[PDB]
Amino acid sequence: SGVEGAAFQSRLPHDRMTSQEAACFPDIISGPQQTQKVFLFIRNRTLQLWLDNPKIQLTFEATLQQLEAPYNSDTVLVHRVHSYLERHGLINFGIYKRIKPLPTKKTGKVIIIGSGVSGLAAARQLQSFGMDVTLLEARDRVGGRVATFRKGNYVADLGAMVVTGLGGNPMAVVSKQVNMELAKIKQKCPLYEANGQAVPKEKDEMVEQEFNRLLEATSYLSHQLDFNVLNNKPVSLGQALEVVIQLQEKHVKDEQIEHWKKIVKTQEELKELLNKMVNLKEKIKELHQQYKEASEVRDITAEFLVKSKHRDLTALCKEYDELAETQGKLEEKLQELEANPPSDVYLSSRDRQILDWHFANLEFANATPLSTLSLKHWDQDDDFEFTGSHLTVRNGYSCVPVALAEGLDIKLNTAVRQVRYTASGCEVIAVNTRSTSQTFIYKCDAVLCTLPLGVLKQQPPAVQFVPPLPEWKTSAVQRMGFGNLNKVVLCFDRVFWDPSVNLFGHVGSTTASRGELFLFWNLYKAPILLALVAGEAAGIMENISDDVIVGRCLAILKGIFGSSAVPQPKETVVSRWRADPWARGSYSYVAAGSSGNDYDLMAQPITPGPPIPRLFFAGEHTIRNYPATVHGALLSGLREAGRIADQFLGA
Numbered sequence: 001s002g003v004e005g006a007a008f009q010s011r012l013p014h015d016r017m018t019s020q021e022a023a024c025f026p027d028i029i030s031g032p033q034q035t036q037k038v039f040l041f042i043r044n045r046t047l048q049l050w051l052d053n054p055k056i057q058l059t060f061e062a063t064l065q066q067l068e069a070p071y072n073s074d075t076v077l078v079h080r081v082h083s084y085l086e087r088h089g090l091i092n093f094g095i096y097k098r099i100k101p102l103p104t105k106k107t108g109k110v111i112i113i114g115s116g117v118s119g120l121a122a123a124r125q126l127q128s129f130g131m132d133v134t135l136l137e138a139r140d141r142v143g144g145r146v147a148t149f150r151k152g153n154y155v156a157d158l159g160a161m162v163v164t165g166l167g168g169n170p171m172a173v174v175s176k177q178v179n180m181e182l183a184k185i186k187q188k189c190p191l192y193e194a195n196g197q198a199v200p201k202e203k204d205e206m207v208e209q210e211f212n213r214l215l216e217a218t219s220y221l222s223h224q225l226d227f228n229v230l231n232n233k234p235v236s237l238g239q240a241l242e243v244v245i246q247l248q249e250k251h252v253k254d255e256q257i258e259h260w261k262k263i264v265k266t267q268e269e270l271k272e273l274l275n276k277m278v279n280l281k282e283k284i285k286e287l288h289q290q291y292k293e294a295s296e297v298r299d300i301t302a303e304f305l306v307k308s309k310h311r312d313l314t315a316l317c318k319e320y321d322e323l324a325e326t327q328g329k330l331e332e333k334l335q336e337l338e339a340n341p342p343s344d345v346y347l348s349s350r351d352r353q354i355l356d357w358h359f360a361n362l363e364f365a366n367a368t369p370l371s372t373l374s375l376k377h378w379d380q381d382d383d384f385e386f387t388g389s390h391l392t393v394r395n396g397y398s399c400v401p402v403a404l405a406e407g408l409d410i411k412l413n414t415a416v417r418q419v420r421y422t423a424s425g426c427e428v429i430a431v432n433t434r435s436t437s438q439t440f441i442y443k444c445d446a447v448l449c450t451l452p453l454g455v456l457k458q459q460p461p462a463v464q465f466v467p468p469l470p471e472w473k474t475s476a477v478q479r480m481g482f483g484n485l486n487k488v489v490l491c492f493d494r495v496f497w498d499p500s501v502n503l504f505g506h507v508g509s510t511t512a513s514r515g516e517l518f519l520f521w522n523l524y525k526a527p528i529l530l531a532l533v534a535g536e537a538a539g540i541m542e543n544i545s546d547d548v549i550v551g552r553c554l555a556i557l558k559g560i561f562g563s564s565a566v567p568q569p570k571e572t573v574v575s576r577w578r579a580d581p582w583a584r585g586s587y588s589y590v591a592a593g594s595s596g597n598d599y600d601l602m603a604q605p606i607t608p609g610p611p612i613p614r615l616f617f618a619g620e621h622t623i624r625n626y627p628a629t630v631h632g633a634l635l636s637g638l639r640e641a642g643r644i645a646d647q648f649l650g651a
């Protein structure tokens, strides 16, 4: 609906106050119900005004003038609701034209570490709020793990490239603000085996159905039967899958055994039956010799003898023909059995390879081998997935952080090395990545750390904290997963693939290598193919040079399309996200022995000892309900900007 749709697009229930709103409006939530409904209408209506035109700042004044009677009479409540929505980044976020220009007097100094989407989104908010903000970025560009290759007409993303559903997604708004072209991903994903032969549609569907069954069985084991600890070790999804596959093969073999038993028993009965017929034919042969001697010789005792032999001899053929139809009733049962054997195996060798492709796909979506994922919590965020098809960024995802950086004070080539925070202020120490001799010392009232989890995990530490971070924070950093995923960009001068197909799969020959170049993406205006390296392959393939890995790509493509069809690429690009010192991997995952609560602990600010919080955290690894995505990075920056403004400017 209308105001209903605005709540939904803001990830809020249209008919209930959230717990956060209840915190900020206790007089409302404890007061009469009719005022609760007035509150919800004003909130939903204000969200609608913003979402229907997110290129323009929505002021309190303009909200008041577009509310209908009688809501435009409660000026104070409107202001309370508008101020709340703005402070937390539900309206007036991203890039939009200001109506009310910024104050020249800044209040409070914030240093933001890192200039990815979470740092940029927080910076824009803090600046909007009238604070003095500087971002320090170690790279020579903004965007972090949004990273687009651009040369001539060639565009290709080496970092994020997928926008998940638009329903509920804040990137829907940013996409409008930046005029980013999104294209829905077409579903057809043909698979080719290692010999290049396409997988018949029916078998692709059979195997995909098994994959879904296996996943559902792991989830039942985990949540209904509490199979989550394995000899005092947290069980991984990988471990659980292989056990469920093991039981399926065990069940196939048992049904084979029960079938071979039915065969053997039927064969035994057929054997004894023939034996019984042998003895009965020998009995008729013997008796028929006595019909011959009796017929040979006629008085009444001899004639009677013929009638008695003839009567018994027909009776013995009555016995024999009885056994004959029991013989047929068996033989047809035997024939039927050895014509309809149950499954010989659960998964043929080729079937298991195709199944391993779907596991590679799952290792892509989590950026890690399945043996590292928490069985219980790997999909702990799935209640928050957006509705709609997934899309890709046709003109390159870097358009979003480039535009978010407009008007911000950003120091590039500036690597933070130490972060000192005391009950009286903060100092950030950074070195210039071009003259390591050159050192800077930025004073500020608060620090917003958007360092990637991979950087926080680094040992020896890349960034030193003074005082060191609390044990409860370092432990969460150690527990949480930080994955890896890489891409090969192949730029050609002609299209030799199916232009109507966005995706196609290469089925690898072994389990261990299932993530090697398993998925190819056709996304761009120029003749460009992207190949993914996922799972165990991702980290290992970083040690292979660009040339050898491109060769392996071309071998795969020549296997699918033909030797003569695949030219040499004009240009190639190969990501190495784990080796990248400013990322150390691609995105977080819920590791066995972690949980969603570690994402909440990562988000918790640090307060210096004997006081107010000085050190704040954002980044994809700090947002429990939306981890490992660009929108989660964004929402985490909006959240921290609100928490920081509440602290230093007042709610």
Ligand SMILES: Cc1cc2nc3c(=O)[nH]c(=O)nc-3n(C[C@H](O)[C@H](O)[C@H](O)COP(=O)(O)OP(=O)(O)OC[C@H]3O[C@@H](n4cnc5c(N)ncnc54)[C@H](O)[C@@H]3O)c2cc1C
Pocket (backbone or CB within 6 Å): 113, 114, 115, 116, 117, 118, 119, 136, 137, 138, 139, 142, 143, 144, 145, 146, 158, 159, 160, 161, 162, 163, 164, 414, 415, 416, 417, 450, 451, 452, 455, 462, 463, 485, 486, 487, 575, 577, 581, 582, 583, 585, 586, 587, 618, 619, 620, 621, 627, 628, 629, 630, 631, 633
């Ligand atoms: C290969 C790949 C595929 C992906 N798939 C997608 C996808 O399709 N869709 C999706 O939504 N998500 C995807 N993701 C994840 C998504 O890109 C990230 O979750 C998000 O971009 C992270 O943003 P961030 O602000 O948390 O961190 P970052 O973007 O990493 O930003 C942190 C910043 O800190 C900087 N920095 C590091 N060390 C220092 C230092 N010492 N001093 C100063 N600055 C420093 C970094 O250079 C960086 O700019 C993908 C990521 C990768 C790498």
Ligand SMILES: O=CCCc1ccc(-c2cc(F)ccc2C(F)(F)F)cc1
Pocket (backbone or CB within 6 Å): 159, 160, 161, 162, 164, 365, 366, 381, 384, 385, 386, 390, 628, 629
């Ligand atoms: O190249 C980058 C892919 C990284 C990435 C990670 C997670 C999602 C995602 C997020 C969700 F909440 C639900 C489903 C998915 C997906 F299936 F796409 F992985 C999308 C992209």
